[PDB]
Design an enzyme around this catalytic site. Structure first.
Site, PDB file in Angstrom:
ATOM      1  N   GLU A  15      -7.113  37.558  16.180  1.00 26.26           N
ATOM      2  CA  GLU A  15      -6.869  37.026  14.662  1.00 26.26           C
ATOM      3  C   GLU A  15      -7.508  38.167  13.092  1.00 26.26           C
ATOM      4  OE1 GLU A  15     -10.381  34.391  16.130  1.00 26.26           O
ATOM      5  OE2 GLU A  15     -10.262  32.973  14.402  1.00 26.26           O
ATOM      6  N   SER A 161      -8.551  30.144  16.189  1.00 23.50           N
ATOM      7  CA  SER A 161      -7.360  30.548  15.353  1.00 23.50           C
ATOM      8  C   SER A 161      -6.130  29.877  16.241  1.00 23.50           C
ATOM      9  CB  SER A 161      -6.737  31.561  15.337  1.00 23.50           C
ATOM     10  OG  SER A 161      -7.606  31.887  13.796  1.00 23.50           O
ATOM     11  N   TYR A 231      -2.441  27.780   9.273  1.00 20.02           N
ATOM     12  CA  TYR A 231      -2.141  29.572   8.432  1.00 20.02           C
ATOM     13  C   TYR A 231      -0.712  29.124   7.795  1.00 20.02           C
ATOM     14  CZ  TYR A 231      -6.341  30.402  11.075  1.00 20.02           C
ATOM     15  OH  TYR A 231      -7.405  30.693  12.176  1.00 20.02           O
ATOM     16  N   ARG A 270     -19.402  26.918  10.502  1.00 21.79           N
ATOM     17  CA  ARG A 270     -18.512  25.911  10.382  1.00 21.79           C
ATOM     18  C   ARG A 270     -18.628  24.621  11.648  1.00 21.79           C
ATOM     19  NH1 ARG A 270     -13.678  27.401  10.438  1.00 21.79           N
ATOM     20  NH2 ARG A 270     -12.861  26.197  12.349  1.00 21.79           N
ATOM     21  N   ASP A 272     -16.758  22.031  13.753  1.00 20.62           N
ATOM     22  CA  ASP A 272     -15.797  21.407  13.904  1.00 20.62           C
ATOM     23  C   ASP A 272     -16.711  20.473  14.749  1.00 20.62           C
ATOM     24  OD1 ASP A 272     -14.614  23.408  12.442  1.00 20.62           O
ATOM     25  OD2 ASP A 272     -13.544  24.265  14.038  1.00 20.62           O
ATOM     26  N   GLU A 284     -16.378  22.739  18.610  1.00 19.26           N
ATOM     27  CA  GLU A 284     -17.340  23.892  18.468  1.00 19.26           C
ATOM     28  C   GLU A 284     -18.196  24.169  16.938  1.00 19.26           C
ATOM     29  OE1 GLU A 284     -15.042  27.045  18.052  1.00 19.26           O
ATOM     30  OE2 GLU A 284     -13.410  26.444  16.130  1.00 19.26           O
ATOM     31  N   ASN A 286     -17.970  27.596  14.620  1.00 20.74           N
ATOM     32  CA  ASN A 286     -17.550  28.609  14.577  1.00 20.74           C
ATOM     33  C   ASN A 286     -18.723  30.063  13.091  1.00 20.74           C
ATOM     34  OD1 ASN A 286     -14.758  28.783  15.213  1.00 20.74           O
ATOM     35  ND2 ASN A 286     -15.094  26.532  14.442  1.00 20.74           N
ATOM     36  N   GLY A 290     -12.846  31.274   8.368  1.00 22.24           N
ATOM     37  CA  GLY A 290     -12.554  31.316   7.965  1.00 22.24           C
ATOM     38  C   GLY A 290     -12.635  31.476   6.352  1.00 22.24           C
TER      39      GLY A 290
HETATM   40  N1  LIG Z   1     -10.642  18.103  23.762  1.00 22.30           N
HETATM   41  C1  LIG Z   1      -9.732  18.075  22.763  1.00 22.30           C
HETATM   42  N2  LIG Z   1      -9.218  16.258  22.306  1.00 22.30           N
HETATM   43  C2  LIG Z   1      -8.943  16.901  21.455  1.00 22.30           C
HETATM   44  N3  LIG Z   1      -7.670  17.740  20.878  1.00 22.30           N
HETATM   45  C3  LIG Z   1      -8.223  19.474  21.275  1.00 22.30           C
HETATM   46  C4  LIG Z   1      -8.958  19.211  21.947  1.00 22.30           C
HETATM   47  N4  LIG Z   1      -9.341  20.990  21.592  1.00 22.30           N
HETATM   48  C5  LIG Z   1      -9.251  21.266  21.472  1.00 22.30           C
HETATM   49  N5  LIG Z   1      -8.068  20.514  20.320  1.00 22.30           N
HETATM   50  C6  LIG Z   1      -7.418  20.864  19.785  1.00 22.30           C
HETATM   51  O1  LIG Z   1      -7.180  22.119  18.891  1.00 22.30           O
HETATM   52  C7  LIG Z   1      -7.682  22.649  18.310  1.00 22.30           C
HETATM   53  C8  LIG Z   1      -8.195  24.160  18.617  1.00 22.30           C
HETATM   54  O2  LIG Z   1      -9.425  24.003  19.146  1.00 22.30           O
HETATM   55  P1  LIG Z   1     -10.929  24.719  19.081  1.00 22.30           P
HETATM   56  O3  LIG Z   1     -10.976  24.072  17.486  1.00 22.30           O
HETATM   57  O4  LIG Z   1     -11.523  24.453  20.199  1.00 22.30           O
HETATM   58  O5  LIG Z   1     -10.200  25.618  18.510  1.00 22.30           O
HETATM   59  P2  LIG Z   1     -10.760  27.489  17.931  1.00 22.30           P
HETATM   60  O6  LIG Z   1      -8.884  28.224  18.271  1.00 22.30           O
HETATM   61  O7  LIG Z   1     -12.292  27.669  18.471  1.00 22.30           O
HETATM   62  O8  LIG Z   1     -10.277  26.740  16.309  1.00 22.30           O
HETATM   63  P3  LIG Z   1     -10.713  27.506  14.766  1.00 22.30           P
HETATM   64  O9  LIG Z   1      -9.920  28.145  14.581  1.00 22.30           O
HETATM   65  O10 LIG Z   1     -10.654  26.469  14.619  1.00 22.30           O
HETATM   66  O11 LIG Z   1     -11.730  28.229  15.435  1.00 22.30           O
HETATM   67  C9  LIG Z   1      -8.925  21.859  17.774  1.00 22.30           C
HETATM   68  O12 LIG Z   1      -8.683  21.384  16.159  1.00 22.30           O
HETATM   69  C10 LIG Z   1      -7.522  19.883  17.859  1.00 22.30           C
HETATM   70  O13 LIG Z   1      -6.222  20.240  17.275  1.00 22.30           O
HETATM   71 MG   LIG Z   2     -11.815  24.875  15.757  1.00 25.37          MG
HETATM   72 MG   LIG Z   3     -13.046  28.228  16.519  1.00 26.40          MG
HETATM   73 RB   LIG Z   4     -16.619  30.026  17.484  1.00 26.74          RB
END
Ligand SMILES: Nc1ncnc2c1ncn2[C@@H]1O[C@H](COP(=O)(O)OP(=O)(O)OP(=O)(O)O)[C@@H](O)[C@H]1O
Ligand SMILES: [Mg+2]
Ligand SMILES: [Mg+2]
Ligand SMILES: [Rb+]
Ligand SMILES: Nc1ncnc2c1ncn2[C@@H]1O[C@H](COP(=O)(O)OP(=O)(O)OP(=O)(O)O)[C@@H](O)[C@H]1O
Ligand SMILES: [Mg+2]
Ligand SMILES: [Mg+2]
Ligand SMILES: [Rb+]
Ligand SMILES: [Rb+]
Ligand SMILES: [Rb+]
Lengths: 326, 324
Positions: A15, A161, A231, A270, A272, A284, A286, A290
């Site tokens: 990232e 991300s 992004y 944040r 989610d 999750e 965060n 961002g």
């Molecule tokens: N169990 C699930 N069911 C449906 N979609 C999912 C699931 N897990 C992840 N996703 C999809 O993948 C995306 C990213 O997953 P996650 O939020 O775990 O990743 P991240 O890389 O930690 O996100 P961020 O950039 O917010 O830190 C989610 O916004 C959703 O679109």
């Molecule tokens: Mg997320």
């Molecule tokens: Mg995340």
């Molecule tokens: Rb996280």
């Protein structure tokens, strides 16, 4: 303004570029005199004018100073780590700042490490009674054991991300998704894919008495909320407040504040969520969200009547009232 | 392969003196050239000769160099943090060493932080199906709510060496117990006291997938395994292999390895258990166990065929294995 802030952005995680974008947003609004330090992708630091040069370039593959850098820490009242992902958001930089004795923005070592690990944070949330999606952890070189049927989402356990994440339809495709995930982490998670799903996000601000922003919703045309969708300007539909009945919005904010307390966060988060067939799941948390032009966290608090400079001012004040409390 | 080790000991936690004693043990058996660095109780570091002087004195209230020290890190191939408790065993020093880029012995940031926190580690372990005693956390300044009968054990959530721990027999004594605990941490735990109780310990060695030592049992005459009992020669007896039914020794070792893997521990841990009314409970994991003259971890692995110099060799090797 006598207050002086040190902003640290960039970093060695995938990232890196997102972190530099977040820096541009924070520097544009922060109401204190603020200097930037950039961690280049090779781990070496760029200071002063070279850090601003790297900011304009939007990526810094090569730095100048090996860690620990020759930075005059005593000039700064607060440090603001804006380093998304591994070696920035996971407690590593927080440990260094604790040893320096510097007040700093956001969660401490243990909460930062815990919230970056998608497996351990889910265990703690589940233990506290917070709904989360069914999941299993898988370690590199160890055969996966998935007590449920695809579609899956496969992730490196410490990602951000959407890097390294796969939507997996057939069990045949699991080993490919896990092998991609293992390029970023020694541990991966396999989650039950919710489909269809709505994606709700809520910001939290505070140390002991977290307060929640309005709930926002993300919509997009892509197969999931992926890196390009996150992004690329215009690709994500960012809906604030979420077009949801007020009671569900209330339950989302309550769950976010509960999780913030359970996981021991401070400064900001944040949180989610997924909403599927009337049921909420915490996706999750965060701890360093961002601050890019397409990022939800500053927008959520704007909608809640906390303007961007005020949001940043409060993060810096919370850093100081945490440290003073010891 | 050339190998020069930097051992760091002392620290700002209440286990400062215990850490210097651990350092004495390690330096006596470690088979590599090893220099000592000492963190004094004021957080300033002592290098070279002043560190050996500090070690001889068995306590270093004041140091020379503010953090980060002018230490010639490039001279060392592996760093061995032997800093028990807050700011040494809890991920903070590990985070610095991660950013420095040097291989280092023992658990990383996340496993260190989680295993040091008696509340967080119980949450994870309980979720994973490991038995643990009933407990609650209390934040400083908030009224406790303890939903089980006394007696209790009250603890700083980050403690070690039994510092700040009280056995509480009546509700009227809870306030004083918590005030003691909060001298050391902003969060305390209150646990159901098992009484009577037997105490079992197992050493683990390895990266995530560990190997377990034989199980050892600690016996003592004091009301509990307290600071004086832990570090006074002769007060604690180690019974090794512990007197257990065969099914029980295996269960203890399996639970230790499961917790170790769930938490993602690297290098080493000593995993402590309670046995009461035939039921096992995992008490805590210590990722930087003691190496003092009365400490159990080197003895557990000695009983399992791993002599003290070889134990230390494997820890340094495990650090390099992870780093590559
Ligand atoms: N169990 C699930 N069911 C449906 N979609 C999912 C699931 N897990 C992840 N996703 C999809 O993948 C995306 C990213 O997953 P996650 O939020 O775990 O990743 P991240 O890389 O930690 O996100 P961020 O950039 O917010 O830190 C989610 O916004 C959703 O679109
Ligand atoms: Mg997320
Ligand atoms: Mg995340
Ligand atoms: Rb996280
Ligand atoms: N729930 C309990 N029931 C009975 N005895 C207890 C309980 N908790 C603690 N004790 C007693 O207090 C001692 C110290 O407890 P604990 O292991 O949690 O402290 P610690 O300081 O982390 O120990 P170490 O020095 O091994 O790190 C135990 O060895 C045991 O004698
Ligand atoms: Mg302990
Ligand atoms: Mg113990
Ligand atoms: Rb699970
Ligand atoms: Rb511990
Ligand atoms: Rb509990």
């Amino acid at each position: 303004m006598e207050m002086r802030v040190l902003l640290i952005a960039g970093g060695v995680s995938p990232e890196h570029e997102v972190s530099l974008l977040s820096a541009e947003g924070v520097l544009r609004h922060i109401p204190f005199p603020t200097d930037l330090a950039v961690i280049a992708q090779d781990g070496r630091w760029l200071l002063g004018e070279k850090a601003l040069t790297a900011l304009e370039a939007k990526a810094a593959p090569e730095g100048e100073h090996p860690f620990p850098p020759p930075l005059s820490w005593e000039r700064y009242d607060v440090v603001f780590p804006l380093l998304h992902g591994r070696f920035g958001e996971d407690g590593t930089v927080q440990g260094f700042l604790e040893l320096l004795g510097k007040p700093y923005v956001g969660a401490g070592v243990a909460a930062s490490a815990l919230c970056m690990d998608k497996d351990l944070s889910k265990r703690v949330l589940a233990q506290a009674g917070v709904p989360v999606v069914p999941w299993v952890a898988v370690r590199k070189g160890e055969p996966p054991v998935v007590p449920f049927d695809p579609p899956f989402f496969v992730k490196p356990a410490n990602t951000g991300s959407s890097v390294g994440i796969s939507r997996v339809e057939r069990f045949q495709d699991l080993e490919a998704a896990l092998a991609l995930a293992f390029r970023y982490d020694e541990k991966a998670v396999v989650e039950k894919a919710l489909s269809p799903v709505r994606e709700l996000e809520v910001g939290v601000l505070g140390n002991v008495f977290g307060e929640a922003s309005p709930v926002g919703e993300v919509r997009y045309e892509a197969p999931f909320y992926d890196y390009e969708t996150k992004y690329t300007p215009g690709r994500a539909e960012l809906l604030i407040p979420a077009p949801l009945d007020p009671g569900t919005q209330e339950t989302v904010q309550e769950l976010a504040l509960k999780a913030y307390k359970v996981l021991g966060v401070r400064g900001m988060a944040r949180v989610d969520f997924f909403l599927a067939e009337g049921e909420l799941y915490l996706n999750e948390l965060n701890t360093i969200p961002g601050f890019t032009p397409t990022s939800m966290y500053p927008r959520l608090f704007e909608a809640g009547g906390v303007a961007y400079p005020e949001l940043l001012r409060r993060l810096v004040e919370l850093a100081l009232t945490h440290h003073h409390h010891h």
